[PDB]
Design a protein around this ligand. Structure first.
Ligand SMILES: *Cc1cc2c(cc1C)nc1c(=O)[nH]c(=O)nc-1n2C[C@H](O)[C@H](O)[C@H](O)COP(=O)(O)OP(=O)(O)OC[C@H]1O[C@@H](n2cnc3c(N)ncnc32)[C@H](O)[C@@H]1O
Ligand SMILES: CCCCCCCCCCCCCCCCCC(=O)OC[C@H](COP(=O)(O)OCCN)OC(=O)CCCCCCCCCCCCCCCCC
Ligand code: HEM
Ligand SMILES: CCCCCCCCCCCO[C@@H]1O[C@H](CO)[C@@H](O[C@H]2O[C@H](CO)[C@@H](O)[C@H](O)[C@H]2O)[C@H](O)[C@H]1O
Ligand SMILES: CC(C)Oc1cccc(NC(=O)c2ccccc2C(F)(F)F)c1
Ligand SMILES: O=C([O-])CC(=O)C(=O)O
Ligand code: SF4
Ligand code: F3S
Ligand code: FES
Ligand SMILES: [K+]
Ligand SMILES: [Mn+2]
Lengths: 612, 139, 102, 240
């Protein structure tokens, strides 16, 4: 091709520089591995920077805690689609992960003992669901992700990690089922780069921008998810999309769940704190899937607020202004800028907003990416994934608030740890065929010079409005099917794309056309997996299949129950595949892992009724 | 795996030899009174210095001494308006720079850094400068 | 010292303060003592101040050394002439009074 | 039924040989646009000119990506209200006195290298004990970091400082200096004196002549001028 291809050789290459990628990247250098971090954004612009409410750790700073209580909250929160071995690892590691962050310099808020301040957060209890509200969300006021990312970035400057900032990863370099590295575009100068490495770590974030309204950054476009799909690998549980209860109305910006953790309440057009009726015990601190469904029924039934009766109010003003200024200063500023609301006098208009992707690239608990052949998992040699892009799956069907930033640092560090115990630095870099990756250049060059009927921004909008109405909080079979048809037609319509910018240096016309390819691969698997999952679990609610369907009826004594066969129940992960030429999705399924790392230390939690 | 010094030197190597433009600045940036007052503190500072050094050079080089050149000017029987305007023009930079100098020495204590206080002390400097100049040029 | 830069910043402020105090001293107790103290402070303050202007605006090792060497010459000649004026002529305070009686 | 607002935006293309900077005017119906200038730039890119190039990501003023010069002042395009006075054309420029990569995208890597240079990370003498326990820090000592840690490194303040315009090669600028102070007064940090020592030269800190443009321009409401003045007070008083 007419593109000068620059070859690099590293021990490891990390794609992404959010919480996950930063912690994996310098963890590897710390372990003595010559590491490259490839990121399309400067590291502190990553969506992690926008995170507010905090990061969970059973530190016991506000009361006596126990990481196995956090374990149980997360398992019950996941609605038993979560892998309990990964969840065991994530909640046991949490105190040491958050202590690591503080010792790095993270300016956590403080208690009167001088320790890390922790707040209540949604769906977290003491004594395995029986002992009341837990306070283990460690926070830097309501700017926790901002401070976590700047702390992690500042820490990474002490190691010899080679950074390749504003490089856009295009595809993995696969040979014989193993990953040999990544091929990427240097945005600053237009050149193509192949990064050969023994191990690759994918920490590329979520894909909330498949929807019309999200809290997510413009850059949350599922790029590492799509590279996996294009490599012929499965993605997992992509139909499980988290609607955060409180995105600010209109702009969509996140108003943290810490507002409810500190005392904020939701009220409708009648002033009722309606969560007292939907969730008698947890009220406004129920799980997000439950609070989002609640808010949604109040609106469509007919008790929405505002001149259009299409949102609800997040009331903070009954709380002391000094608490609001110490605990919630960030959203106080954002509510004024993006809604003109002064939080000490008037409520914040909020509605369920696409926020987070439970699904991702399937991994084991060590960070290694897996495929699934003939009923057994098979690690993909050389390929790892952590953070929102990954499906460990610590979150299953519904993530607990403040578990993601934890996930970021626990499994970012796990990838570093696992490579450290598995490989040595300096091992021979694997050869790539001389033309490895040239189909990514050919695709990029066809998009650079595309000149059809449907400009990129027009097709992106057709995708976002199609996901927004056909794959929302509540779903039915007929609506999901028509969204599958609309998406598949949009995906073929990509043959009609038109770009205008024929340059190669900082051509965001072309890069955003690449993100649209990425976004659509994510969107197809999301909505087709949704249409096929004929049950209600976590954030996936079918009104034509309102029940959770597990291998037993766990709402009854199990003695004398005929166990449902794997193919006749839904307590299993969705695995999704895309033939990238056609756009055709194929679905397979793999079992949920119910065992922990140590039954004597941490009991496996069997399915149960799930109420807040 | 580059140090900050290497990154800095690579930046200048790369950019000073490139075809890249320097984006505009003085021609496009919007004015404020603090900014205009910072420029004026520099300009009156330099003007006072250069005037102090001219006086010193005239002391070393003029054929006659000071009271002659004063008597010369008194003989010209100049108008009070022209005397007043000249005096004002002479004391005004000294006055401006002294008060704004005081405002700077406050800043060096860490006081007055809220932006609305930067505006208040600026205007306070303007009115003390105007009052002291008009009064001294009437002495 | 290896604290040269902050000792300089502190001296700048010390000398500026001195010169402030000389202005009432010149109006109140004019004479030889204030004349020569004004000669010293006026020259020191102006010299340091013009060196900040040069540091800001002049770049390159040779223009920097040229600018600064000329500044020493300007300052040295300035202090010399002000002392000359104070010894052989009427001095600073008296000169201002005479000017202001025009 | 419409309110047409005019934007005049700085344009340059490195892939055009001999391209000289120009300004291009776009008309935008404010009734079909969000309230912020970034919303206008995204609308223009999607609907009128997909060649218009700029950095953006978070659209809520927290990532720092979209710093540019709007209506004469450095701000975040995503939190800068569109000026609805239709008689006025809004002029949009890159951050001032920077090498322009393309259109509204400046090369920020010297800025990034100056931040790296002050070692923006907690340092302790005995670091053998890190990873074991949380360091203690009082509520009072944590309060000292308020107004310093919120910085988003957008470079709005530094690229508004005339000192950084003439000596950005050697003067760290208000952003990086306020972060040096953020670590100097972190009560957990043990290198306060080494961090001051590093600023003992004519340029790194002492090109600051208190112009106060940094504080006027900061979109987070922070005060780097005040922070630079507390650094200066510490420089003159500490003992080796
Ligand atoms: C949207 C959001 C999420 C959020 C939150 C607030 C908001 C507004 N608050 C949270 C909180 O208080 N507590 C918590 O546990 N989670 C919270 N979240 C969710 C959470 O922040 C995210 O799930 C998480 O931060 C994601 O982190 P991760 O490291 O996995 O990914 P990222 O920060 O999105 O960064 C992605 C990086 O990957 C690089 N990238 C992306 N595409 C490419 C390509 N094509 N090539 C190269 N690199 C790529 C990006 O540059 C970026 O650095
Ligand atoms: C060519 C150079 C031009 C620029 C150079 C800048 C020079 C700045 C440094 C000058 C500092 C000297 C200030 C000295 C002031 C006091 C000296 C004095 O005794 O003058 C008397 C005169 C008022 O006299 P009278 O009201 O009769 O009362 C006298 C009782 N003590 O006092 C006055 O009313 C006059 C004060 C005005 C000073 C303006 C100086 C010009 C600048
Ligand atoms: C007679 C005086 C002369 C000839 C003079 C001259 C100067 C000059 C040339 C500068 C440098 C300006 C700059 O760097 O922008 C300066 C700065 C300064 N002057 Fe004066 N000045 C006089 C009186 C005063 C007085 C009475 C005060 C009180 C004062 C306070 C200051 C201060 C604080 C500065 C520091 C400027 C900064 O920090 O940027 N000056 N002066
Ligand atoms: C010796 C004489 C030296 C001083 C005289 C020079 C006169 C020229 C000054 C030019 C000042 O120009 C003017 O400054 C003011 C006040 O800071 C600016 O005002 C700006 O800041 C203030 C608050 O700080 C806001 O109230 C206002 O809405 C804003 O636009 C205004 O946009 C600018 O147009
Ligand atoms: C856009 C305009 C109003 O803005 C400008 C333009 C040119 C110079 C300046 N102001 C200085 O040049 C100045 C003034 C006083 C003290 C120190 C300086 C210094 F250090 F050099 F930056 C401001
Ligand atoms: O997603 C999370 O973990 C929590 C979040 O956005 C919030 O602060 O409400
Ligand atoms: S200080 Fe204010 S303006 Fe300067 S970089 Fe940080 S946030 Fe951006
Ligand atoms: S504008 Fe510049 S000169 Fe100092 S006070 Fe701010 S860094
Ligand atoms: S786009 Fe993140 S600050 Fe404007
Ligand atoms: K995920
Ligand atoms: Mn067709």
């Amino acid at each position: 091709t007419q593109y000068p291809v620059v070859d690099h050789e590293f021990d490891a290459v990390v794609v992404g520089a959010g919480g996950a990628g930063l912690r994996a990247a310098f963890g590897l250098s710390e372990a003595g591995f010559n590491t490259a971090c490839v990121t399309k954004l400067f590291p502190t612009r990553s969506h992690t920077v926008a995170a507010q409410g905090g990061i969970n750790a059973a530190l016991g700073n506000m009361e006596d805690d126990n990481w196995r209580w956090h374990f149980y909250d997360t398992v019950k929160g996941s609605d038993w689609l979560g892998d309990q071995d990964a969840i065991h690892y994530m909640t046991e590691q949490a105190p040491a992960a958050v202590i690591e962050l503080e010792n790095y310099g993270m300016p956590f808020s403080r208690t009167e003992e001088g320790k890390i301040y922790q707040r209540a957060f949604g769906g977290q209890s003491l004594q395995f669901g029986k002992g009341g509200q837990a306070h283990r969300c460690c926070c830097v006021a309501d700017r926790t992700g901002h401070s976590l990312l700047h702390t992690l970035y500042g820490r990474s400057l002490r190691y010899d990690t080679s950074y390749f900032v504003e490089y856009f990863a295009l595809d993995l370099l696969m040979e014989n089922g193993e990953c040999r590295g990544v091929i990427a575009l240097c945005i600053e100068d237009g050149t193509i780069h192949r990064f050969r490495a023994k191990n690759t770590v994918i920490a590329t974030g979520g894909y909330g921008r498949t929807y019309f309204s999200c809290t997510s950054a413009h850059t949350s476009t599922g790029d590492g998810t799509a590279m996996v799909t294009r490599a012929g690998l499965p993605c997992q549980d992509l139909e499980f999309v988290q609607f955060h209860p409180t995105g600010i109305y209109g702009a969509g910006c996140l108003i943290t769940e810490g507002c409810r953790g500190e005392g904020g309440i939701l009220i409708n057009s009648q002033g009722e704190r309606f969560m007292e009726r939907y969730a008698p015990v947890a009220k406004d601190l129920a799980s997000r899937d439950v609070v989002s469904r609640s808010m949604t029924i109040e609106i469509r039934e007919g008790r929405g607020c505002g001149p259009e009766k299409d949102h609800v109010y997040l009331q903070l003003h009954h709380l002391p202004p000094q608490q609001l200024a110490t605990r919630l200063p960030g959203i106080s500023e954002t509510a004024m800028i993006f809604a003109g609301v002064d939080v000490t006098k008037e409520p914040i208009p909020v509605l369920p907003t696409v926020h987070y992707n439970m699904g991702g690239i399937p991994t084991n608990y060590k960070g290694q990416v897996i495929t699934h052949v003939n009923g057994e998992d098979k690690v993909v040699p050389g390929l790892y994934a952590c953070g929102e892009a990954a499906s460990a799956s610590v979150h299953g069907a519904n993530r607990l608030g403040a578990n993601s930033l934890l996930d970021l640092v626990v499994f970012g560090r796990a990838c570093a740890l696992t490579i450290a115990e598995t490989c040595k630095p300096g091992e021979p870099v694997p050869s790539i065929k001389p033309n490895a990756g040239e189909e990514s250049v050919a695709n990029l060059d066809k998009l650079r010079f595309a000149d059809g009927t449907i400009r990129t921004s027009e097709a992106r909008l057709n995708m976002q409005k199609t996901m927004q109405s056909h794959a929302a909080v509540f779903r039915t079979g007929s609506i999901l099917q028509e969204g599958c048809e609309k998406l598949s037609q949009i995906y073929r319509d990509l043959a009609h794309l038109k770009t205008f910018d024929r340059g190669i240096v900082w051509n965001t016309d072309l890069v955003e056309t690449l993100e649209l390819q990425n976004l659509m691969l994510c969107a197809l698997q999301t909505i087709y997996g949704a249409e096929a999952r004929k049950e209600s679990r976590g954030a996936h609610a079918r009104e034509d299949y309102k029940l959770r369907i597990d291998e037993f009826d766990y709402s009854k004594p199990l003695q004398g129950q005929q166990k449902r066969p794997f193919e006749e129940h839904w307590r299993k992960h969705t695995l999704s595949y895309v033939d990238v030429k056609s756009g055709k999705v194929t679905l397979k399924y793999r079992p949920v892992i119910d065992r922990t790392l140590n039954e004597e230390d941490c009991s496996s939690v069997p399915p149960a009724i799930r109420s807040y | 795996a580059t140090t900050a010094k290497e990154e800095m030197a690579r930046f200048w190597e790369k950019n000073t030899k490139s075809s890249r433009p320097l984006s505009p600045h003085i021609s496009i940036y919007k004015w404020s009174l603090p900014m205009a007052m910072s420029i004026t503190h520099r300009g009156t500072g330099v003007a006072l210095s250069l005037g102090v050094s001219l006086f010193s050079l005239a002391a070393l080089l003029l054929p006659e001494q000071f009271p002659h050149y004063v008597a010369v000017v008194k003989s010209l029987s100049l108008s009070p308006a022209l005397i007043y305007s000249a005096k004002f023009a002479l004391v005004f930079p000294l006055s401006y720079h002294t008060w704004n100098g005081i405002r700077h020495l406050v800043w060096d204590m860490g006081k007055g850094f809220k932006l609305s206080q930067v505006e208040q002390s600026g205007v306070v400097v303007l009115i003390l400068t105007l009052l002291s100049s008009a009064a001294i040029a009437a002495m | 010292s290896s604290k040269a830069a902050s000792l300089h910043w502190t001296s700048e402020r010390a000398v500026s303060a001195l010169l402030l105090g000389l202005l009432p001293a010149a109006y109140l107790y004019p004479g030889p003592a204030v004349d020569y103290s004004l000669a010293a402070a006026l020259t020191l303050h102006g010299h340091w101040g013009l060196g900040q202007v040069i540091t800001d605006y002049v770049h390159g090792d040779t223009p920097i050394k040229v600018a600064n060497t000329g500044l020493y010459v300007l300052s040295a000649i300035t202090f010399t002439g002000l002392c000359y004026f104070n010894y052989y002529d009427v001095g600073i305070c008296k000169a201002v009074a005479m000017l202001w009686s025009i | 039924t419409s309110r047409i607002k005019k934007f005049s935006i700085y344009r340059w293309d490195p892939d055009k040989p001999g391209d000289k900077p120009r300004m291009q005017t776009y008309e935008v119906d404010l009734n079909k646009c969000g309230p912020m200038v970034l919303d206008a730039l995204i609308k223009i890119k999607n609907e009128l000119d997909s060649t218009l190039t700029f950095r953006r990501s978070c659209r809520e003023g927290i990532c720092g990506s979209c710093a540019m010069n709007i209506a004469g002042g450095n701000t975040l395009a995503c939190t800068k209200k569109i000026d609805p006075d239709l008689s006025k054309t809004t002029k949009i420029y890159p951050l001032p006195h920077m090498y322009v990569v393309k259109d509204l995208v400046p090369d920020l890597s010297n800025f990034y290298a100056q931040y790296k240079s002050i070692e923006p990370y907690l340092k302790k003498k005995d670091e053998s004990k890190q990873g074991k326990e949380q360091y203690l820090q009082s509520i009072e000592d944590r309060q000292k970091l308020d107004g310093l840690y919120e910085c988003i490194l957008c470079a709005c303040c530094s690229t508004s400082c005339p000192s950084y315009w003439w000596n950005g090669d050697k003067y760290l600028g208000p952003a990086v200096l306020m972060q040096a102070y953020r670590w100097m007064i972190d009560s957990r940090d043990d290198y306060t004196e080494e961090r001051l020592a590093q600023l003992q030269d004519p340029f790194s800190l002492y090109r600051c002549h208190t112009i106060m443009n940094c504080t006027r321009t900061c979109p987070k409401g922070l005060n780097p001028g005040k922070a630079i003045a507390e650094i200066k007070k510490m420089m003159a008083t500490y003992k080796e």
